[model samples]
Every structure is written in structure tokens, then in C-alpha cells.
Target: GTRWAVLVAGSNGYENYRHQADVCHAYQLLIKGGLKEENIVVFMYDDIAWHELNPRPGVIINNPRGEDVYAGVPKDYTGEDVTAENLFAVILGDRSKVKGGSGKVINSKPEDRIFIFYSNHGGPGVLGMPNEQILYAMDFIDVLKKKHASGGYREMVIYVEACESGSLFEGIMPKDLNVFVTTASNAQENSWVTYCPGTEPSPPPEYTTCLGDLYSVAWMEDSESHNLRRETVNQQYRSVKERTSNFKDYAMGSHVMQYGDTNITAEKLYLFQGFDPATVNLPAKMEVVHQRDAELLFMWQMYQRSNKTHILKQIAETVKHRNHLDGSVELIGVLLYGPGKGSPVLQSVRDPGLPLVDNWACLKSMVRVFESHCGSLTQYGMKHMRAFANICNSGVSESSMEEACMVAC
Candidate 1:
């Protein structure tokens, strides 16, 4: 049976370098394991490598001393072409519907094996895309259902790295779909960014950010050192979970999790990692770093490393803007609830439970309303999704949610 893989990094800009780097590294590993380039599809914004802010032009690295992963990585769907609709179209193998790039789709037989990896900024019930678009949990599930009905593959595995990523699968994915899913964090918390200042072999230059994700790097490094033919997906999941769960220093700790057909974890890693298990060999172990907030870590690194007054001023301005935005979100909560229940409402919005997200129409409405007035929800606006969800749960009208966003945002 043939093997097919899809790797996606859904954000751009230097601050989000880790996502694209993670995708490139995954591509490298898949090729090394014997998956042909033509059978694998890649999607990324493709902006950071040659951006003026990048110290090394046209090159992206996942680790400090690691080789440039961007060398041979294909740009199947890049820049404005990386969108929610395009991603769904690719999975369904609908070449005619694709908007740009190579128009490569996941063409596989019923007996084939498939692997999909996605890394980016996300919020409750949604994964962010390059523009203002979002991949809603239910919409993604519908795409998977269509793929399954089309008899595209025998088995499929998915790895998602993002904040509140488990929401994409928790209680939503049907076990009968024959898909195995793993996520960087559960529905309520933030997935972390690792390999900051002190963790690299040679410290990154002043004003630089993390190069890779905590959960993604752990699993990829494990793949680097272990023989795919002998290693089990369950073993890799456990190792990544252990490493990602030990971040006590970070205020919001990540909880790595699995969903949908848990028994699939027992399968050999080779099924997803490579096309030919006999030709693959294990390499030496690579070092890993602990987890932390990517945005906060980047700001702190810039503050500690840069001596320039202008750079410090830039950092100060960013902090002030973020503080103002946070206040606006808090005010929206207060507006939603009068003085009597304001505090509880704010708290509820701030720390919400991981309830099963089956409300796709409401989710899309909330996301669209917010983005219409405030801009992309993936930016500083994502934190406000919980408040919108709270509005929906409180039985407030959709128009009321729109009014709240209009007033506060």
C-alpha cells in the first residue's frame, strides 16, 4: 500500500517562525523514511525564510545546530493560497477546487496509509489560517467524513500543535472514522513554545525567538533517534506527553492528549513515518527544551538580549498595547454582565471549562463577527473566543455577541 502525508504550518511572520520550521522538519523526516516527494503535500505561508527580519536569508532551522530544513521543502500551497477551504479541498483530493501552488491533493487508494501534521496558533473550536480564515472543528470533521466515504485510505493519523488543540477532536471525532488523533494541549490551556535562550547550542542573536514547538520537537527528535520499524506511536505519544507536561514555570501548563481510536497507537511508527521500513535506520538522539509561552518568551528574550533603546521602546509599546487589549476584553465581559455578576462572568470567560464543542454555526458566527470589527481572531483577539463562547452558552443572542464585539473591540 502507498503512503501519503500532509504537513501544514498555518501562520506567518518572524514571531511565528516555529510553526513553519516544524513543518519543514516533518517533511525532512518523512522523506528520510522513504515517502516520495510527490506523494507528500505541504502548506505554509512561506514568508519568514527570506523576510528582512530573518538573520539567515532563505534558510529555516528547527534547532540551533540543525541543518536548514527549508532546503528541499515543497511549497504546494503558500502565501495567500494557504486557507481553510484549500486545506479541506486537498484532503478530499479535489484538484479542480484548489486555488494555487502545485494543486497537489492527497490522492490515495483505500488500502493506503495517511499522516497529517498541523502547527499554528489556535483557539477554542478553531485553527487559524494565514488570512482571517479559520478551520472550524466541525467543518474539518465533515471533510474527514467525506474522505472516509470516498474510500481514500485504510487508516489515518493526525498530529495537531496549537493552543486548545484538543478541542479539534475531543468528543467530536467519531471513533468509527478509523482516524487516530493527538494534540499538543487539551481544550482549556495553551500549548507551549520551547528551545528559548539558554537551551540552544549557540544562543540565537539578540531579538530572536524560539525555533521549534515543545510537543512537535519532542516527537520529531524521538523519531530521529528511534527505529521507526520498532517504535510504536503510543511510545512516541507518551514521551512527548511527559516532556510537555513538566512546564511548571509557565503559568498555563500544557496537557498533551489523544483522541479517536486510541487503539491505533499500538501500530508501528513505520506505518506513518515511512513508505519502506527496511531502508530506514535510527540516528543519534537530539536534545530537547522545556515549554513556555511563545509570545512572552520572545518579548523577554528581546528585553534581556538587546541593549538598543529603540528595541526596548518597541517592547514597551507592545506590552502596553497588549495590556490595553486585555482591558478591552475584560470590559466586554463586564458589558455582557452588569455590576452584580461582572466578576464571575469575567472569571468564567478567563478560565473556561473544556466543554465538548459541537456548536459549529455559533462558532463561525462569533468568529466572523469579531474578525469583521477587530481583525484576525488569531492575533491578540483569540483570547476573546472564550468570552464569545460564554455568550453563546449564556443564551445571549448572536446579535448581542456582535454588539459586544462592536463596542469593545
Candidate 2:
């Protein structure tokens, strides 16, 4: 199985600083996670001087000097001078190079998995064009919807980190496409933060990193430990938002929106085999199963921990430091674990019959990923059965490194 991924990092104006930094950070995370450099694409628009790829021969020139000049890189950075037009040209080189889409260089066998990432001053619009008149999220949905309808590829996982990005998921989510849109703020929301200096801004003067941008770190650092994939990212977003609400600096931010049904967990293509309970011996099998179970249990526990009262208490004592009779905090925690009937612990505290929401959404995403990518389990295998077994029998769960290393064995 071949996994294809596209990382689109766009920053306009001064935000290019944040966007570029974010792009580099995101690029590092992806590479660290094993994605090849050739498979990823980065788009940046700043003081449109010239464009150049990394490496020495990276210099590429498209637009000479006109209205298209972006800022950032020192005017004397020297290499083959590249402008926005030429910069994109340098990156994409030839539109025909695109394999799956309606592009010219279509691969005879297209990739089943793809990751599209973006970071720009999002104000509702498509990529490439200026922010004001560019395409809104609805436009993005339409384009992808058309692609999914055409059935060029089996799954498309989109990871967007822009402002007003939730709109991408607000519209029609194609049934077959696995889409995940992580925006900096809600449609009407605006991100306020500083971009670490020195980079091109997309459509606007790129400034600092937004408060919502923190989600990127949380997404990377907590993905495995928290068993985050695509949808779980949503859970983490909601949780972090609630946790940091009182701290004016990073508060009022929400995580990116996720849509579609593609299961990222199961679709992951490993460079090597890791683990399979059905084939491994008893010791390995027991270890794997136990690890899986613990992950599942942790999901349950996390949900239990999201109790509003409990969360509020922690917030008051920590962030607000307001012991007054009234603390100005509205608490909301998404459920992430327990039996299908709903979280027993939470029910005991909050409204029991409300029906758990976000956590279940995240769980379904995880289940979908595992089943689709990981090999089939033994007949009637429990979800993350190896993990569950370990927690039930050995009382020790496989560590993150252990799980990642042994998963494909």
C-alpha cells in the first residue's frame, strides 16, 4: 500500500513568519513521522521577490518584479531568485507532476491515502488566490466533493490550520472521503498571536502565531500517547480549549474541524511490519493485546475525567486563582471512554441521558483507522484487543515506543 501526502503551508502578509515557522515545524513532524520530502508540498507568499526550493539548486524564477513581489527572505538571500509565481513553480514544478487529481502527471496507480495541510491568514477562500476574493470553505468542499464523486482515490485526509476553517466541514462532507479540517478559529473567529519574525506573509502581513496554533504542538505531542489520529485531534482540541479558557493568552481558541469517514488509524502504511496478535506467540500476543486494552481503558478514563465539575475545579484553582464564591468559567469536556451505554462516572455527576458526543466521534474515527489499515484481527476480536488483554492480565501496558515498534511485528 502506498500512502500519498500533500502538506500545504500558506501564509500571507506578515503571518508568513508564523506560517513559515509552522510549516517548518509541521514538515519536521511529518518527516520525523516518516513521510518523505518528495511527497510533501509547501506554499508560501510573502515579499514576492523570487522563489527557491531548499538545497543549493533550489532557486526558481517565475514572475520577475511586478505587483506579485512577496516579502520576508532578505532581499539579498541569493540563489536563483524566485517570486510567488516562480516559487510555486519551483515547488510544484509542473502541474502535470500532480498524480491523483485532474492534473496531468496522473499515476497509473494512485495513492489511497493523502494528507493536505495549510497555514495561512484564513478569512474564507480557496488556496492560491488573494484572501478577500478567494474561495470560501464552501468552495473547498465543492472541489473535494467533486473529486470524491469522481472516485479518483479511495481516501483523502485534509488537515487545514487556517482561520475561519470550520466552514470547510460545515458544507457537504463527501461520504467516501476521510476529511479532517483543523482551523485556528471558528468562522467568525479571529486568531490573535505573534508570528516569530522573518518569513513571508500570505494574503495579509503575516505576524505572530495565533493562540489556536498551539493545537499543532498538542496534535503532535499527544497524538500517540492520547492515541490521536484524525478525529481524536478534534477531541484534543475541545479538551485543550476548555482547559485553557481562563488563560486569556491561549483561551477562546478551538481545534480544527474534522469531516468525512476515512479511517486514518487503520490506513497507516508502515515501512515495516510491527505487530499482529494473530501471528505473534503468546508472550508477544499477550503484550500487544494488553497494550490495546489499556489504550481503550484510557479513553474511558479520559472521558470520565472530563466531568464539568471536576474540570471547573481544576481551572479555578489553577488558571483563574479566583477563590471567590463565583468564578467566571463555563466548563465543557467531551466524553472519551467507557461502555456503549455512556460514561458511568460522568453520568453520576452530569446529565446522564444526554448521550456522549465528541468522544464517540473520536472513537469511531480510531476504530475506522485501525480496521482499515491494521491487518484483520482474529474472529470477533475486541477493539485494541491486545491492549485490553494486557491491562486485564499483566497489569502493564506497552509503552508508546514499545507499541509503535511492536505494532507491525
Candidate 3:
């Protein structure tokens, strides 16, 4: 049976280099594992390689000493082409329905094996994308169901790297769909970035951050050094989970998790990786770095390395933006639950319990309104989403949510 893979890095900008780097690294692994380039589809904003802020033009690396991962990376769906709608179309093999992209779709038969990898920013019930677009968990589940019903492949595996990523599959994906899913974090926490400083073979220049994700790097690094024919998905998950959990420095604690057909974890990695045993060799052991928030790590690096007025100004702007988001959520809380009661409610949203998203439509609408007024709500703005969901659960009207954003924003 043929093997097909989908790699997606759902955000853009230099600060988000890790996501695209992760995608590129995954692509290289798939190619090394014997998947043909044409059988693999890639989706990314495609803005980092030649980005003005990039110190190394036209090259992207996932490890400090790692070779360039960007070389030969295809831009099948890049820039504005990396949209939720187009991604769904590709997975469903509906090439004609694709909006913008290279028009390449996942053309797999019922007997084929498929692997999907996505890395980016996220919030409750949604994965962030460029141009203020989001891929809703429900929408993604629907597409997966459609693909399954259409007999697109015999089995599929998905790896999600994002904040609150498990929400995309928790209590949603069916066990009988022939799918296995894993996430960087559970439904309520943030995923992390690693190899930021001091650990690289050559450390990044002042104010620059590492270009890989913690969980993604952990799994890929494991794959790099191990025999795919003997390694199992369950083993990889455990190794990554242990490595990720050992780090307590993460701004937002991450809890790596698996979902959907958990039973499939027993399958050999080769079933999904498609690596030819004869062509692969064990890689040298590498050190793992402590994981931390990507944005926070970048901010800290900037503060420590550069004191330029412009850089400080950027930092101030970020602080101001986060405060503004807090105020908007506070205003919504006040309008919904009275002045005295709202403060605690707002705090409740800040350090929420399991499952921050209760109402998908309401949470999505609130996030859309906020993003429409302010900007992309995935970076620091993601923390406010749980508060928005709390407000929705409090029975606040959609109109009220919109009105609060209009006035407070």
C-alpha cells in the first residue's frame, strides 16, 4: 500500500519560525522514510525563509547543529493558500473544490496509509491560521469523518502541536474511524518551544529564538536516532511525553496526550513512516533543551540581547496588547455578572480547569469578534479565549459579546 502524508505549519512571521521549521523537518523525515514527494502535501505561510527579520536568508533549521531543513521543501499550499477550507478540500481529495493553492490534493486509495502533522498557535476549540482565520475543532472533525466515509485511506495518524490542542479530538473523534491522534498538550494547556538558547551547536544571535517545537523535536529526534521498523508509536509518545513533562520552565505547563484509537499505538512506526530499513542509519544522540513558551522566550531573548528603542517599543506594545485583551474580557465579565462578581469570574477564566471550551459556536463567535477588532487572537491573546468561553457559558448573548468587544476594544 502507498503512504501519504500531510504537513502543516499554520502560522507565519519570524517569531513563529518553529512551526514552519517543524513542518520542514517532518517533511524531510517522511521523504527519508520512503514517501515520494508527490504523495506528500505541505501547507505553510511560506514567509520565513526569506523574511527580512531572518538572520539566515533562505535557510531554516530545526536543530542548532542540524542541516538546513528548508532545502527542497515544496510549497504546495503556501501564503494565502494555507486556509482551513483548502486544507479540508485537500484531505477529502476534492481537488476541484480547493480555493487557492497548487491544487494538489490527497489522492489516496482505501488501502493507503496516511499521516498528518500540524504545528501552530491555538486556543480553545480552534487552531490559528494566517489572515485571522481559524480551523474549528468541529469543522476538522467533520472533514475527518467525510474523508473516512469517502474511503480515502485504510488508516490515518495525526500529530497536533499547539496550545490546547487536545480539544480538537477529545470526546469528538470516534474510536472506529481507523484514526490515531496525539497532541502536544491536553485540552486546557499550552504546548512549548525548546532549544531556545545556550544549547544550540551555535547559539542564535542576540534576540533570535530557536526554530523548533519541544514535542515535535522530541518525536522527530527520536525517529532520527532509532530504527523505524522496530519503534512503535506508543514508544515514541511515551518518550516525548516524558521528555516534555520533565521540563517545568514552560510558561504554560504542557501535558502531551493521545486520543482516538489508542489501540493503534502498538503499530510499528514503519507502518506510518514508510522508512526503508536498508537505507536508514542510527543518528548520534542529542541533548534535549528545556521547553518554554515561544513568544515569551523570544521576548526574554530580545530584552536580554537588545535594548534598542524599537525593540523595547515592540515589547511595550505586546504588554499593552495583552492588557487590552484582559480589559476587554473584564468588561464582558462585568457586563454579564455585575461589577463585584465579574472580577473573580475573570480570574476563573485565567486559570481554568479542564475543557476551557463548552460552547463551540459561542466561543468561536467571541474569538472572531475579538480578532476582527484587535488582531490574531492566538499569541498572548489566546489566554483570553477561556474567559470568552466562560462568558458564553454564563449565557451572555452573542450580541452582547460583539457589543462588549466594540466598546472595550
Candidate 4:
């Protein structure tokens, strides 16, 4: 009746080193983001300390280090009590043996939504196609597809955030019901197993990334309330891609999603209820203002010079931020306040080294440089201005602009 989730995280050796922390963080985000506490299930491998600290009220099944089977804890609290059977129970392996359904939790009716996430080590060899060989983990995609074909579930979302996880989605995503499938990277791409800086080798190897984990974080952080209408799975996919690109250098790794027919948005499906508004203070509005000003300045200058040498110098200076990129008012130190493309002033300036207003200016330049040949000056200017306003309003710092620049503008 309510939304439910299952997280299979932390394999042995490298898997423990790579996935435990990130999956755990995702688990916490799910909880923090308002997923029904009782509807969530977790399958943890070897990270007993984490298991003890973050217990799921519904279930916490442990798997053995080298084996794929489940293991229960012993009566002796000091000793691990799980057996391979316990692990099987968590994945809906056996309805009679476990408390949960069999890998697929379909509602009696067809409107219920199910969200499933998997973060572990996987590759091309493990996946065999439509009727693939599911070696260790449950054949979740198969289970889900069968459920959908039977008209038991209206929609299903499957996110596989592991290496080569894309293989699972190769031949099985259906076209009738709303079925969404996403992988951390393309079938050929190798997803990274990142380590949190300075905190490596502790808490069972915490993992962080520039792009791959953005969706889990965004959903947990609540990026959907903006009121735009897109398919639910597509919205999540796009949000993750956009956020990943904005936050880091790469597009949130590589992903392919299939949202067939249903118009489900992340906001309508999952409730991200606990994000602190104050903490998420994204300055999406200020970014717009900064870009508008930059575009105004850029157009005014463009008409003033047709000389290539002069334009080159001016562009270089703007990029360097050494000769006042804004052009509205010439302030010497204003250049030092930010870089051409790195400023949050013009775009999303996540880096503290650059000022926020410059982000807008940088974006305007980027639009003109890369896109000017494709569109009119007016169109480019408007696009630049809008993008700037978005970053400025979405949590950019007021101090990004120098006092003189702000006063002059």
C-alpha cells in the first residue's frame, strides 16, 4: 500500500571497501527523505558495525563474507547470528521462509509503486540477457517484469548503482506499464569505487562520488518541488544527470532509463519529507540575476568591437577575470573576485575559490562561445540570463560579488 525499498549493499573484499558506506548513506537518505521506516529492507554483507548502528525496523539480514547465501546472528550477541537462509529471506527469495515477498512486492491492486536500489560489484559476465543467469543476488529485474506483466503493479523503479549494472536492463524493460531502469554507468563504462578523503579505511570504507550518487542524494535532498511536469522515472533520471553535471566535471556517470507510459514524477512517488529547508538553501534565483546582468554587458560590448584582436583580448581578460568581466563598472579587484567560468555569480559556484556572480558571467560566455552559431543573439542572451538567475537564487552566496560591483549593479 505504501512505498517500499530494498538495498543490497556491501559485498566482501573490494565491495566492502567500495560500496558499504555509500549504500549506507543512501539508506540514511531514504529514511531522512521520508520513506516509510517500516517498509524499507536492507541486506548488508560483513559490515556488522554499520548494521548495529543503523538497524532497519523491518529487517536486517546479513550475508557471509565469501558466500552469496544469508546467515543469521547467534544467540551470543558477540557472535554473528545469520545463516545463508536469512540472506535469501531479504530478497524475497522464499515466501514461506522469509517475512517479505519473493523478490517482487506487488500490491493486490495495480497502482502501488515500488522502489528498489542495488549498490554492489557486478559486470558483463554476470548478466546473460532476458533470461540471464543471476549468480548471487536475486533476479530482481525478472521478478519485477513478471509482476508488471501480470497487472499486479502499476509502476516499478529499479536503480542499479554498481559496476556494469546496466547489463540487467539490456533486454527486459517492458513497454506497457511504467517500468524505469537505471544503471550507474553504461554497459561498457566502469563505475568508480570512491573513498571519502581523509576518512578512508574506517567505518568499513566509506565511498563518495562526483556523479553516480546524485539521484539518491537529490531525492533525499528534495529537488522535485519545483512543479515542473515530467515522467516520474525520467524526472529522477534527468535530475540526477543535471545535478551531477553541475556538481562535478562528468555527467552523473552513464545511465539509460525506460519510463513507459506512466506520468510519475519523483515528487509524486517518493516523499522527501525531512530535508531541512534552511540547510538546502539553494540560491537558484540569484543565479538568474547574475546572468541577466552579464548578458546585458556582453551584448553592449559585442556591438562596440568587431576587431578580432580586441575581442580576443577582451575574452581572455574575461576568462582570467583579471580585467573586470562584468564590463558594467570597471573595478580592479573585481577581477580577482572570480574566474570567468568558475563563478557561482553567473552559474552554480560550488567551489569557494570563485565568487558566485562570476558563475553567471562565465555561463553567458559559454553560451555565446559554444552556442552563438546555432541561435540568435537575443535567444542566447535570454538563455544566459535565465541560467544565471537560477544559480544566483539557488543557494549562491551574496558575498560572491564585491561590494563595489553589487553597489554599481
Candidate 5:
């Protein structure tokens, strides 16, 4: 029996320190469960450990208790090498199409089990990669379909950490494909980052950014000290769902969700992570920052800590950008549906069991059209993309969308 995993940290920059830290901790858990380093493929921007602002150079941790997860972690894909194309190719074992990194690909037999974990910023129907164009849900699910047809593994499980991450699988992925998924948020909400600068059990004072994601650390911390072979994925899911509920604190909590083949969740966690016994102790007064606002929070912390001129500029620019995003999206909504109708319609979520959009291509083209007029949808701007999908779902014509953006942006 063999197990293979793909761990992806989809964003870079010190402000996004938590994504890579989350990925590294996953790597450690797999190793602890008996998977060899070669069976685990890692994809991270590789920019955090030695970052100039790092208080502990060459080390990464997910909590204040502080265990350095950086050492011995393999650099399978880093820097410019991190891309959706490479990730797809790795999952498909399509060596001929692979482009960079350590050149390692999952070469599993039919009996092998596969697991994938992606952490980073997500917008409607898309997930980010540090150096490449964003990964669209349509293209990603197609690759999973391709791999399923190839019978590369017996079963697969995925855990995605991001804002609006459920959109990636909701009403898109097929259940019979034997792939199970759990996401940090529903298609309509924002997930959160934990152990941030101002939170209880906060990172060491030197850290201006957070160290881990809330739902991510909850599930992972559970894995660390438990019997994977004995616990069901569904059981662990229940525990994490409970811990992830911190809405009483800042009203920023999200519903952790699962989609796809529900039956596989009955399988023991060891089938995917192997067997390593060890771990749950989440702290009280838990604090979290919405993932999309994480960088802005980081900048604010920096300015608070130093009040330097450049740092102040970063804060000012971030605020201006956030306001622009809000204003632009609202205007686009108004243009599409009328002055007052757009805002309410654009911000609403689809009814349960309805996919985010009827067509992925339409969603992508609409997003491109908006970005072309409005400029980059930087990680934070990504949250507004749900409006773009709404634009597509409303069957707004390309010319109308073009005109709306030209006028609104």
C-alpha cells in the first residue's frame, strides 16, 4: 500500500506567512504518519523563512508554542516554479508536460491513495499561485477528472484553505469520481487566519503577520495527537467544525464545509495520512483575521510597531485600494442592475445546491473583462470576484459587461 500527497501554499510575501507555514506543518504530519519525504510533494513560494522581517531565520511555525517546520521540508516547487500547470501535471503524472521545480511527480499505482492540501487566497471559482496566473475551478476539476479516468489512485481527499473556497468544488466536482473535499469556507464566505499579531497565544512579538489559518490548524492539530487509523475523517471533521466556530469572538468565523464523495469520509484517516499516534488543545479567547484582510492587518501592525514613513505609505495604499475595490464593485453592480439594485444582488449567495455559475468559461471571461478595466484583483480584491460570477450568472452580455466596467472602473 502506498500514499502520495501534494501540499500547495498558493501565495507569497511575508504578510501571507501563514499559508506556507500551514503547508509545512502538513508535511510534518504526513511524515509523522509514516509517509517518506519522496511520497510527499511540496509547492510553496519559498519566500517566508529567510524573509528580511523574519525574527527566526530559516524557521517556520504554526503556533506560539513554536516548532520549526522548515528544516527537512523538501522544496519540490518554489519561487517562479510554483504554478497551476506544474501542479496539474504533477497530479496527472504527465512528466512530458512538467516545467520546473524538483521534477518529482506522483507516480502512484492504481491501489495508491492520494491527498492534496492547498492553502492561500481564493476568490470566486479561483485559487491563487504566487508566480502564475490564478487557477480556475473549471480547469482544476477537469484535471481531477483526467486523473480519475487514468485510475492513478484508489481514492483521493482534498482540504482547501481560502476565502470562498467551497466554490471550487460546489456543484462542480462529481461524487462518483471518488474524490472527497473539505474547505475552510462556503462558496459565499471568507475564512480566517489565526495566531495573528493581536491574538491570544499569538506569535512571538517579532512576527508582524499571522502564523496559521484557523480551520487549517484546527484539523492539523487534531491530526498531530490522534490515532489516524482509528478516527474517521467525519469524526475529525466534527471536532474541527466545532473549534472553527469562533463567530462569538469577532463575528468573522466561516462555516467549514465538505463536498464530493461522502462515503470515503468513513475511511480511516490513516488510509490517506498513514499511521502515527500522538493530539487537541485550541486556546480560549481565540482571535482571527479574515484571510483577505491579512496583509492589510500585517501592514497596520508594522506601522504600529515602527511608524516608519514607508510603512505608513503601505497602510495608506492598502486602505485606498480596499476603498477602490468596494466602490468599483458597487458601481459595476449599479451599472448592471440599476443604481440601487446592483449592490444587494451582487453580494448575495446562490441558493443551496446551486453552483456559483452555470458556465466556468463565462465566469473567467467576465473576470478578465473586469480586471482589464479595473486592474489587478490583488489577493484582497479577489473577494469581489463573486460579483463577477453573479454578473455572468445574470447572463449579462459581454458588451454590457465591457461597458459597465469601462464606466464603473
Candidate 6:
């Protein structure tokens, strides 16, 4: 069967430097594995390489010593084109339904092998995207179900790198769909970024942010250094699952989790990444930073380098936004639950084996109500999404959510 890949870096901005780098390296991997450019679709923000922060214009390297993966890369979907709709459209191979980019869809036959990778910030059940658009766990699974129902491929694999990414599939993905998933973290925690500037195995000195995510690069590095034709999917997962969290000083790592069609692990790696083996040397002695601290890391680096006091303002705003979003969620919780202890109720997590929320509609409507009444949920505020899910799971009416939003917003 032919091989096809769809890669998406869900977040954009100077802080999300590793997000785009992860996708670009994956593109290079597919190309090295003999997957034609036409069979691969890349959704990247396309701004980091040329941003004022980057020292080398039009250049991006995966590691400190690696070559530039940004060279000769395809610009399939960039900027505003990197949206949730285009992501689903490209995966479904529906060019007619896609609204932007180079018109490159996966377009694979039913017998083909499909590989999908998404990396960036995520909340409980929502994956981040440009323009504040989010890919909900339930909605993403719905799209995959539609594709599977259409007999879109022989088998498919998805690799997700984000905080709380496992929630994207934990209780929603069907085990019989022949679709496998490996997320950076379990449904409850955070993912870390790696190859940061000034670290032990630091990125280029000119670079101020990270080069790749812990889970994102772990599997890719394993793929490159080994022969895929001789590697099993299970072997790759096992290696990456270990490497993502193998610490430098004190050990700190997220749970590298796999879901759906566990039997698919027996398949060989070449079934998805192709037969041509990619070669690259692995770096030693690396460190990780928490996902939520990524932006602050960038800001702190910029401040240290340029002595710019404005970064202080940005840092303050970030904390203030986080504080304000939490309070708003608390107000909504109070309006919906009780007076004194309302907001704390919203911070609870779902039981294992259950979906993130009881009703998907209620979850979606809660987000709408809050955003419509309160304000946009910026990246810093995304962590409060679990609060929204808790409110919905409590069986509160969506109209009441809006009614509460009137006071909260």
C-alpha cells in the first residue's frame, strides 16, 4: 500500500518555535522514507523562521548539529490556512472542501497506509490551533470515524504531542477502527519542550526558544537512527515512550500513551513511514521545560539577551490573563453550582474509562457561552478548558451557562 502523511503544528508564535520545527522535521522524514511530496500534507504557521527573533532567515534545524529541515519544504497550509477545517479536510483527502493552502491533500487510496502527526499546546480535550481555533477531542474522533466509514485506508497511525493530548482519544477512539494513537501525555498532565537554548544540549546559541517537543522529537530521532524496515511499530513506541521522559538531572516526563487498535502494534514501521531509511545522529544530554512555561521561557530569554523591560509587561499580562480566566471560570461555576465553592467544583477530572465530558454538545456550548460573554480564551487561558468540561459533565443547561456568562464575562 502507498504511504501518506499529514503533519500539523497546531500553535503559532515566537514561543511555539518547537511546534513548527517538529512538523518540518517530520516532513523531511517522510521525504527521506520515499514518500512523495504529493502524498504528504504539512500545516505549519510558517512565521518562526523569518521572525525578528530568529537569527538565520529562512533556516530551521531540528537539532544543534542537524541540517535545516526548512530548506525546500512545502508550504501546504500556512498562517490563517492552518485551521481545524483544513486539517480535517486534508486528512479526509477532500480537496474540494479545503479552503486554503497549496491544495495538497493526502489523497491516498483505501489500501494506503496513513500517518498523522499533530504537535503543540493542548488543554484537557482541545488541541490548540492558530486564530484561537481548537480541535476538540470528540470532533477529531468524529472526523476519523467518517474517514474510516468511507474505507479511507488500510490502517492509520496518529502521533500527538501536547499537554493532556491523550484526552484526545482516551475514551473516544474505537478500538476496531484500525487507527492507532500515541499521545505525549495521559489524559491528565503536561508535555514538555526540549532542545531549548542555553540547555546542556542547547540549540544554536542564536536561537532563544526550543527546537522541538520532547515527545515529538523522541519518536522522530528513533526513526532516523534506526532502519524502519526492520523496526516494528511497537518497537518505535516503546523506545520513544522511554526517551521522552528519560531525564538529565531529576527525571520529569509525561506519560507517553498509546490507544486504539492495540493489535496494530505488530505492524512494521515502514507500513507508514515508507521503506527508504533515514540517517541521522542522535544528540546526548538534553533537558526539558514544561509546556505552560514555554512562552515565559522565550520571554525570559529575550529579556536576558536584549535587556528589554517590555518582556516584563508581557510576562505580567500572561499571569494576569491566567489569573483572570481562572476567576471567570470560578464565577461561572458559582452561578451554575453554588455560591462559595462553585469554581472549585469545576476543577475536577473525569473518571478513568469515561469521556472528558458527558455530552459533547454541552461541552461545545459551554465554550461558546464563555467565549461569547467573557472574552476569547487565549493560549494562556486554555488550561481552564477542564473547567468548561466539568460544568458540562454536571448536566447544567447550555442556556444557563450563557446566563452565567452574563455575570462572569
Model 1: per-residue lDDT, tens digit, 1-409?
Answer: 8889999997887878899999999999999998989889999999988988778889888876657899999989999899888899899999998888898999889999999999988876678888656677888889999999999999999999988788777767888888999999887777877655565345465428678887888788788778888888899898888777764433534678898878889999889987335445653222333232566656666666654677677778767766765776676677778765755654463223345433667766866776676555445556556666666666667787678778977
RMSD of 1: 3.5
Top TM-score model: 5
Candidate 2 wrongly placed segments (more than 4 Å): 46-94, 97-111, 124-133, 192-212, 221-251, 262-409
lDDT of 6 at 260: 93
RMSD of each: 3.5, 21.4, 3.4, 21.5, 2.3, 2.3
lDDT of 2 by residue, 1-409 (tens): 3444444444333223334444445544455455555554544443322223111122211111112112222221111221233223322324643332223111212344455556554432223232322223444555565555455455555555554455435434554555544455443334433311122222122211221143443343333233222234345445434432224332334433445663543443222111222322321000011111222332333335564565455444433322120111000001122244222322221122121122322323332333343433221122122222222222222242234223422
Tens digit of lDDT per residue, candidate 3, span 1-409? 8899999998887778888999999998888888999889999899998988778889888877757899999989999899998899889988999987788889899999899999988876678877657777878888889999989998898999887787677766777889998898877677777656655345554428676887898889888778888888899898888766755534434678887788889898888987656546662223333232456557667777754677777878877767777777788678667899987775563232344556677777877777777566645566566677677777878887677767766
Cα lDDT for residue 279, candidate 3 = 43
User: Model 5: per-residue lDDT, tens digit, 274-360?
Assistant: 877443222164777888778877877787886589988878887898898789889989888997789778988887567788878
Model 5: lDDT of residue 379: 73
Model 6 agreement with the true structure over 1-409: per-residue lDDT tens digits: 7888999998988788889989999998889889999888889999988998777887887777858889867899999999999988888889999997999987777899899999998998899998788778888898888898888898999999989887888778899889999999888888988888888775677788888898888999888887777788999999888787664232468778899998879998988987653342231546789889888888887888777778889889888887788788887878888986685678777776678886877787888888888788876667887888888777777778878899877
- List TM-score per model, in order: 0.88, 0.43, 0.89, 0.45, 0.95, 0.95
Which runs in model 5 stand beyond 4 Å of their true positions? Answer: 247-250, 277-285
lDDT of each: 0.77, 0.34, 0.78, 0.38, 0.86, 0.84
- Model 6 is weakest, by summed lDDT over 10 consecutive residues, at 276-285
| Model 4 superposed RMSD (Cα) | 21.5
- Candidate 1 Cα misplacement greater than 4 A, ranges: 200-207, 247-253, 275-293, 296-317, 340-358, 373-376, 406-409
lDDT of 4 by residue, 215-268 (tens): 343433333243222224456576665543334443323443333343444444
Clashes of each: 0, 63, 0, 48, 2, 0
TM-score of model 4 relative to the true fold? 0.45
